[PDB]
Design an enzyme around this catalytic site. Structure first.
Site, PDB file in Angstrom:
ATOM      1  N   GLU A  79       0.814  -1.193   0.000  1.00  0.00           N
ATOM      2  CA  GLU A  79       0.000   0.000   0.000  1.00  0.00           C
ATOM      3  C   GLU A  79       0.857   1.256   0.000  1.00  0.00           C
ATOM      4  O   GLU A  79       0.566   2.195  -0.766  1.00  0.00           O
ATOM      5  CB  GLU A  79      -0.960  -0.024   1.167  1.00  0.00           C
ATOM      6  CG  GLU A  79      -2.169  -0.962   1.066  1.00  0.00           C
ATOM      7  CD  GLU A  79      -3.178  -0.614  -0.055  1.00  0.00           C
ATOM      8  OE1 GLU A  79      -2.967   0.399  -0.735  1.00  0.00           O
ATOM      9  OE2 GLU A  79      -4.068  -1.440  -0.328  1.00  0.00           O
TER      10      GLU A  79
ATOM     11  N   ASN B   3      -7.267   8.858  -5.838  1.00  0.00           N
ATOM     12  CA  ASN B   3      -8.080   7.852  -6.511  1.00  0.00           C
ATOM     13  C   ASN B   3      -8.792   8.499  -7.693  1.00  0.00           C
ATOM     14  O   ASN B   3      -8.949   9.750  -7.750  1.00  0.00           O
ATOM     15  CB  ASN B   3      -9.109   7.316  -5.510  1.00  0.00           C
ATOM     16  CG  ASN B   3      -8.466   6.558  -4.390  1.00  0.00           C
ATOM     17  OD1 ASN B   3      -7.575   5.758  -4.643  1.00  0.00           O
ATOM     18  ND2 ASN B   3      -8.939   6.753  -3.171  1.00  0.00           N
TER      19      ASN B   3
ATOM     20  N   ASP C  34     -11.944   8.621  -8.288  1.00  0.00           N
ATOM     21  CA  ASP C  34     -13.222   9.274  -7.899  1.00  0.00           C
ATOM     22  C   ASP C  34     -13.068  10.588  -7.211  1.00  0.00           C
ATOM     23  O   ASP C  34     -14.049  11.139  -6.798  1.00  0.00           O
ATOM     24  CB  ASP C  34     -14.113   8.316  -7.068  1.00  0.00           C
ATOM     25  CG  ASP C  34     -13.512   7.988  -5.679  1.00  0.00           C
ATOM     26  OD1 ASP C  34     -12.418   8.464  -5.363  1.00  0.00           O
ATOM     27  OD2 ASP C  34     -14.149   7.273  -4.892  1.00  0.00           O
TER      28      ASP C  34
ATOM     29  N   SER D   6     -11.393  11.035  -4.286  1.00  0.00           N
ATOM     30  CA  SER D   6     -10.980  10.702  -2.939  1.00  0.00           C
ATOM     31  C   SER D   6      -9.406  10.496  -2.962  1.00  0.00           C
ATOM     32  O   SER D   6      -8.784  10.442  -4.035  1.00  0.00           O
ATOM     33  CB  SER D   6     -11.743   9.441  -2.489  1.00  0.00           C
ATOM     34  OG  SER D   6     -11.302   8.265  -3.148  1.00  0.00           O
TER      35      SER D   6
ATOM     36  N   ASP E  89      -6.175   8.326  -0.736  1.00  0.00           N
ATOM     37  CA  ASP E  89      -5.761   7.298   0.266  1.00  0.00           C
ATOM     38  C   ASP E  89      -4.567   7.859   1.090  1.00  0.00           C
ATOM     39  O   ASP E  89      -3.647   8.371   0.500  1.00  0.00           O
ATOM     40  CB  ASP E  89      -5.255   6.035  -0.430  1.00  0.00           C
ATOM     41  CG  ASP E  89      -6.365   5.202  -1.090  1.00  0.00           C
ATOM     42  OD1 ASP E  89      -7.568   5.502  -0.913  1.00  0.00           O
ATOM     43  OD2 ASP E  89      -5.993   4.143  -1.689  1.00  0.00           O
TER      44      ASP E  89
ATOM     45  N   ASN F 274      -8.909   5.485   2.850  1.00  0.00           N
ATOM     46  CA  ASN F 274      -9.550   6.271   1.797  1.00  0.00           C
ATOM     47  C   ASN F 274     -10.474   7.331   2.454  1.00  0.00           C
ATOM     48  O   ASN F 274     -11.260   7.005   3.319  1.00  0.00           O
ATOM     49  CB  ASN F 274     -10.345   5.252   0.961  1.00  0.00           C
ATOM     50  CG  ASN F 274     -10.868   5.792  -0.303  1.00  0.00           C
ATOM     51  OD1 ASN F 274     -11.049   6.999  -0.439  1.00  0.00           O
ATOM     52  ND2 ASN F 274     -11.191   4.896  -1.258  1.00  0.00           N
TER      53      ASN F 274
END
Ligand SMILES: [Pt+2]
Ligand SMILES: [Pt+2]
EC number: 3.2.1.17
Length: 129
Positions: free
Chosen positions: A35, A46, A48, A50, A52, A59
């Site tokens: 990650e 991301n 969309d 958003s 992380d 998120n």
């Protein structure tokens, strides 16, 4: 902070992720590796809108408020910048909620694709735990 492999296994163990909802410590360390590369400062956008945050790439769509993710939730009730500290408490405590929500570790795309079904115990090999 960039953790060493065994250093993070030990911190994760201290905060109670060892077999938390049946996921062995090796799962959690594997998830962190892929990650964030063990980097508490990692942030990634991301598709969309958003973002992380932190060592477990939690998120803003659902789990934290970053001020710029419209129509999202803040289920861990934290600012997303709390997830970037060198102390992993906030990330761990929020991960506990995420993994308990019915989907388990599948919430972590890197875990699903790179750790799930693998010999995860290798991630804690050689560590004093
Ligand atoms: Pt700690
Ligand atoms: Pt803790």
């Amino acid at each position: 902070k960039v953790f060493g492999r065994c250093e993070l296994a030990a911190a994760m163990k201290r905060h109670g992720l060892d077999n938390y909802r049946g996921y062995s410590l090796g799962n959690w360390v594997c998830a962190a590796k892929f990650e964030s590369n063990f980097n508490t400062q990692a942030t990634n956008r991301n598709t969309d809108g958003s973002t992380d945050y932190g060592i477990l790439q939690i998120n803003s769509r659902w789990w934290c408020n970053d001020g710029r993710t419209p129509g999202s939730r803040n289920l861990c009730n934290i600012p997303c910048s709390a997830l970037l500290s060198s102390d992993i408490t906030a990330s761990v405590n929020c991960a506990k909620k995420i993994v308990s929500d019915g989907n388990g570790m599948n919430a972590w795309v890197a875990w699903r694709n790179r750790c799930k079904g693998t010999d995860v115990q290798a991630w804690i090999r050689g560590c004093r735990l």
